[PDB]
Amino acid sequence: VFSQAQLCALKDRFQKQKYLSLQQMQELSSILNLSYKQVKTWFQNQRMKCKRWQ
């Protein structure tokens, strides 16, 4: 579970960059006080929603 602010940031970045580097996800997780695994997992799941084709 993420806070309102934390989700706000994640979605903001996702809108600007669908794929973050390994370094960027680590850096970003520290800034938001999230684990690296939480951030990477959030981006992976975010890329899976709302598909019209594979």
Partner: protein, 302 residues
């Protein structure tokens, strides 16, 4: 006021590598210069007289900035730190640690209780001046940050980056309130009244934006700027000018409203990375890179 007549009054030598920034002190008495030679130098604003050398940074400095009372400086360096300096004593009062790569840009807010920094590590940091502690780290960009600047009352921060974004931030909360959107954004700053934003992109273009409406109001061209992050200025002391340096070694001056080039200042022998306008007098300072290593002072009648 049709055209100004800036003329070379002084050439300030001393730096051993490229100069990276020049800033007049808000009291108009001093000019400060930063250099890849790891040094900050203080010069007499009106006579160009060398005053003192401030040392301490372990690597090159990209940017230096005055406090509102003119008694403090802040520097951003390749040793990943910012330093706060007491100008009179030259001593380092605080070393701001937290960025994970080069710090590129820095600025006090008007109250001068805060410092905003921007870094190659793609973030923007907000620091408490009194304690030297980092209050906030904005995940601002996804490429190196080129510029950071507070608005007239300090409620807003604008940031620019190689990632092509210019972003407006709520100082208090750290939330992003606007993105103006692609070419890299090399410099950015608020107009003196805080209504406008001046932005430099690496397609040889400067633009005056209204961030409220998100419309481009003015576009200035003629100069060369495809590689370096060159400051631009609002000259308000006499005529209403826009002042920028150029990669063809000249200082360009446009009339804010007609967008027309009114003057080009010849004298530097390398890219002019930084320009500054005196706070009360028609005086321009400019600084060039390694094939030059000098600061130049120009004066105009309007």
């Amino acid at each position: 006021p049709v055209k100004p007549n800036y003329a070379l009054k002084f050439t300030l030598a001393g730096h051993t590598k490229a100069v990276s920034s020049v800033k007049f002190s808000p009291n108009g008495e001093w000019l400060a210069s930063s250099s890849a030679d790891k040094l900050i130098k203080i010069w007499g604003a009106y006579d160009g007289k060398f005053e003192k050398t401030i040392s301490g940074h372990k690597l090159g400095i990209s940017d230096v900035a005055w406090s509102s009372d003119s008694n403090l400086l802040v520097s951003a360096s390749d040793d990943k730190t910012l330093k706060i300096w007491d100008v009179s004593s030259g001593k380092c009062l605080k070393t701001l640690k937290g960025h994970s790569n080069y710090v590129f840009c820095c600025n006090f807010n008007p109250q001068s209780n805060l410092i905003v920094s921007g870094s190659f590590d793609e973030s923007v940091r907000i620091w408490d001046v009194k304690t030297g502690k980092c209050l906030k780290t904005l995940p601002a960009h996804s490429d190196p940050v080129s510029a950071v600047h507070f608005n007239r009352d300090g409620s807003l921060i604008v940031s620019s980056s190689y990632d092509g974004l210019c972003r407006i931030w709520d100082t208090a909360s750290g939330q992003c309130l606007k993105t103006l959107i692609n070419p890299p954004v090399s410099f950015v700053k608020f107009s003196p009244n805080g209504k406008y934003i001046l932005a430099a992109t690496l397609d040889n273009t400067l633009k005056l934006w209204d961030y409220s409406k998100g419309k481009c109001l003015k576009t200035y061209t003629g100069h060369k700027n495809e590689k370096y992050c060159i400051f631009a200025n609002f000259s308000v002391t006499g005529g209403k000018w826009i002042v920028s340096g150029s990669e063809d070694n000249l200082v360009y001056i446009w009339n804010l409203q007609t967008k027309e080039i009114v003057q080009k200042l010849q004298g530097h022998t390398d890219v002019v990375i930084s320009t500054a306008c005196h706070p009360t007098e028609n005086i321009i300072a400019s600084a060039a890179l390694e094939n030059d290593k000098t600061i130049k002072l120009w004066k105009s009648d309007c």
